[PDB]
């Protein structure tokens, strides 16, 4: 069984490291299990306030800076938002280019997340020193494609490098790691530790290439600069040579996804099968991504190839349509002013009011987004369940591939283990569609180079921009008055997932998901980290 202490009392983990931004987690523990939780975001910046009175054309440049990890996505969301407010339909080439940069972002983001943010909760790096590299190469030759990076020679050079580093006395980023001296919550054999660490170091180099791919279309990374109202500016991005380079780089990235990421993900999952019963939630939302028709929010919702939808109480037999009128934000338990509850984002209000640390009545800089009173989990798992339930052929194949490979039922995906595997799943599917997408724009480009449509700024309008960012459902909501920004509101995936309670005192997805967490060691509560990281938290995103 899962290691579990008898500890009864509070645990606070602040900072939660290996996320974007500043999060404090508070839990009550009773006999070694979490009985209650609070997700407390610890920084406020106020981009919504800052945007007021500005040129709607500028929004995307400000909102991009909501987050530099999920770079681009907010520029995209704002461009869609303003495109909608001015009623412009972007050219097909602009639709394709925008969607491909999103694809490149998914690949970059998910890779960095698994290896450099998440993996250290499951992998004991210093145990890797106890591995015999010849045995590791042998274990690797079994559970994973043949590759020279998994040779004994390669694996012993990693081991050697890490040995010199550890014996230096300067542990750097591994200083005080929860795994030093062993830890009953860490299950991997030393050999798997060595494989996973070798891949961790390779991933550091491959993420560079994934960002280079993105920069071909996006101008630079982080913080792209190629989107304009009415479309894109990057006419070079439609030509033969840049697109060939982009393909080449993407294929290198995708090879690494299929040779390292998936096999590792699957190995880890295989040893942590008990985590298929920890960290489940019930409701899922997606706005869909990769649409063939981005002429309107309605068309995006309907034509996303990663489909949109709403799942409630794990009912895979009934995926509803997204009602964008049915979204609102509560602030009852957030550091904002009285009178702000139940606001649709078009009527959004952002009036910050701090009280005190660990005030059980007001404990977060995140608002609480709700869908008809329901907290909704967003992100890769949501997309996966929704696509699965709709019978999207790629997800159906891959999910059942993973189910059969781990020998578990579909229902073990309602978990931290599932949340983690889903991220890998969707990376594999993006990878499988890159060449198709690239060839479609190359062809489209070759024929005609319309990239930007003409448009007029209205005196008064409203618009919404939808995207399924790497972390989940994202929306930007604008009100234009006197040709300026009257209200601009972000509702962001992390807001959905890691926000505080809503007006009825109902726990958010991470808060619910934490309930029932076993704690082997309250001094070193790695288990809290496993679940929180599975959500891939971004606090700068969530609070903006």
């Amino acid at each position: 069984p899962t290691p579990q202490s008898t500890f009864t009392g509070p645990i606070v983990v602040d900072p939660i490291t290996r996320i974007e931004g500043h999060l404090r987690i508070m839990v009550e523990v009773e006999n070694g299990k979490v009985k209650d939780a609070w997700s407390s975001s610890q920084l406020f910046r106020g981009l919504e306030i800052i945007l007021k009175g500005r040129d709607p054309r500028d929004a995307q440049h400000f909102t991009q800076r909501a987050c530099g990890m999920c770079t681009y996505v907010h520029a995209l969301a704002s461009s869609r938002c303003v495109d909608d407010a001015v009623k412009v339909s972007i050219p097909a080439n602009a639709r394709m280019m925008r969607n491909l940069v999103m694809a490149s972002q998914y690949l970059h983001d998910h890779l960095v997340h698994f290896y450099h943010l998440h993996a250290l909760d499951w992998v004991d790096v210093t145990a890797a020193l106890k591995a015999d590299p010849n045995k590791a190469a042998k274990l690797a030759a079994s559970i994973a494609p043949a590759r020279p990076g998994n040779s004994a020679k390669a694996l012993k050079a990693v081991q050697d490098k890490l040995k010199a580093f550890v014996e230096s006395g300067q542990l750097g980023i591994f200083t005080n790691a929860y795994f030093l001296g062993g830890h009953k919550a860490y299950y991997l054999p030393p050999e798997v530790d060595l494989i996973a660490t070798a891949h961790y170091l390779e991933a550091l180099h491959m993420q560079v290439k994934a960002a280079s791919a993105m920069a071909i279309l996006g101008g630079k990374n982080p913080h792209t600069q190629f989107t304009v109202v009415g479309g894109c500016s990057n006419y070079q991005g439609l030509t033969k040579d840049p697109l060939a380079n982009y393909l080449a780089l993407s294929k290198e990235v995708c090879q690494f996804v299929n040779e390292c990421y998936i096999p590792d993900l699957l190995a880890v999952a295989g040893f942590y099968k008990d985590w298929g019963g920890i960290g489940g939630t019930s409701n899922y939302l997606a706005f869909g991504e990769f649409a063939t028709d981005d002429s309107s929010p309605e068309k995006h919702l309907a034509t996303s190839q990663f489909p949109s939808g709403v799942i409630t109480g794990r009912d895979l037999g009934k995926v509803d349509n997204v009602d964008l009128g049915a979204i609102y934000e509560d602030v009852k338990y957030s550091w904002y002013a009285p009178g702000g509850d139940g606001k649709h984002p078009y009527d959004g209000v952002t009036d910050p009011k701090y009280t005190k640390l660990d005030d059980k009545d007001h404990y977060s800089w995140m608002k609480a987004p709700r869908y008809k009173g329901k907290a909704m989990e967003v992100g890769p798992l949501a997309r996966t369940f929704i696509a699965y339930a709709k019978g999207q052929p790629d997800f159906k194949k891959v999910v059942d591939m993973v189910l059969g490979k781990l020998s578990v039922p579909a229902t073990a995906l309602h978990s931290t283990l599932g949340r983690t595997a889903a991220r890998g799943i969707e990376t594999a599917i993006v990878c499988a569609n890159m060449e198709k997408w690239i060839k479609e724009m190359a062809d489209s480009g070759a024929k005609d180079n319309t990239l930007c449509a003409k448009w007029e700024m209205p005196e008064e309008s409203k618009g919404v921009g939808l995207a399924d960012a790497p972390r989940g459902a994202l929306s930007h909501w604008i009100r234009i008055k006197g040709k300026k920004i009257d209200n601009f509101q972000l509702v962001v995936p992390s807001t959905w997932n890691l926000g505080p309670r809503g007006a009825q005192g109902d726990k958010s997805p991470v808060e619910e998901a934490l309930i029932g967490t076993p704690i082997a060691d309250p001094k070193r509560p790695v288990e809290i980290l496993r679940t929180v990281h599975a959500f891939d938290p971004c606090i700068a995103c969530g609070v903006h």
Partner: protein
């Protein structure tokens, strides 16, 4: 077993783009940097320790016998006694001030730490400040939103092995920030001939005409973008888009509206 110099990296009011920019380095790659050149002793984005374990690691690096260098990412929110930006239950200003006190040197990575950046834009609800303003201490500024990894790693390596590079009036190393974006722009002959794109959909835009009439802040921005490119492949103006002036102090208010000059 040669001792590597200690680097403490703090995150305050930031979007983590500078951390992301930093790890795009290729000369050397980040792993070679942290395994061979420096001892990266605190870095919240990637460090294994969490919570009290993490906070201890910081207090270990700060108390290290050989001293440390300070890298700061993000601005400092100062309203309500710094309480709108907190880590481990302390205001960021408090912790940054603590860390600055004993630092061998302070490098501000990004426009946020250097000058205040995006959260300081009007009407500045969190009363955000850049570091040197919040702390009253000289910083080496590596601005940009985010800066090129070449500029950051170049600065770091230069400080560890040569000394403090020559800075301009805004604390930026002249090695990377000595020249206007505009002076190195492949579109400069179009600018000189008054061949301007009037819009993004125009034939002129398609023909790669100068983006000045669409707000390009190249002629007033100091950065090395077109000489060194980003990710070894591109830069904004090459991707058809005007420069935002993102390396200039308070650019969010001085370079806006971004699609204008006025």
């Amino acid at each position: 077993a040669k001792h590597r110099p200690s680097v403490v990296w703090l995150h305050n009011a930031e979007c983590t783009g500078c951390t992301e920019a930093a790890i795009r380095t290729i000369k050397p790659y980040i792993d070679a940097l942290i395994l061979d050149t420096i001892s990266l002793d605190y870095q919240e984005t990637i460090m294994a320790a969490a919570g009290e374990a993490a906070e201890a690691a910081l207090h270990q690096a700060l108390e290290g016998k050989d001293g440390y260098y300070l890298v700061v990412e993000g601005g400092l929110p100062t309203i309500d006694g710094g309480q709108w930006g907190m880590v481990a239950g302390h205001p960021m200003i408090e912790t940054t001030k603590k860390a600055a006190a004993k630092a061998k040197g302070i490098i501000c990575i990004g426009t946020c730490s250097a000058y205040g950046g995006v959260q300081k834009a009007k009407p500045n609800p969190s009363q955000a400040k850049g570091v040197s303003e919040a702390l009253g201490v000289k910083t080496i500024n590596i601005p940009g939103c985010p800066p090129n990894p070449i500029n950051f790693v170049g600065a770091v390596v230069h400080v560890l092995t040569k000394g403090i590079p020559d800075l301009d009036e805004n604390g930026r190393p002249k090695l990377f920030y000595g020249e206007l974006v505009h002076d190195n722009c492949p579109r400069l002959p179009h600018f000189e001939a008054s061949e301007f794109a009037p819009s993004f959909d125009s034939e002129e835009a398609k023909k790669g005409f100068c983006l000045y009439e669409l707000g390009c802040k190249g002629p007033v921005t100091y950065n090395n973008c077109p000489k060194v490119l980003f990710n070894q492949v591109n830069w904004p103006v090459q991707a058809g888009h005007p420069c935002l002036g993102c390396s200039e102090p308070d650019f969010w208010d001085t370079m806006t509206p971004f699609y204008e000059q006025g």
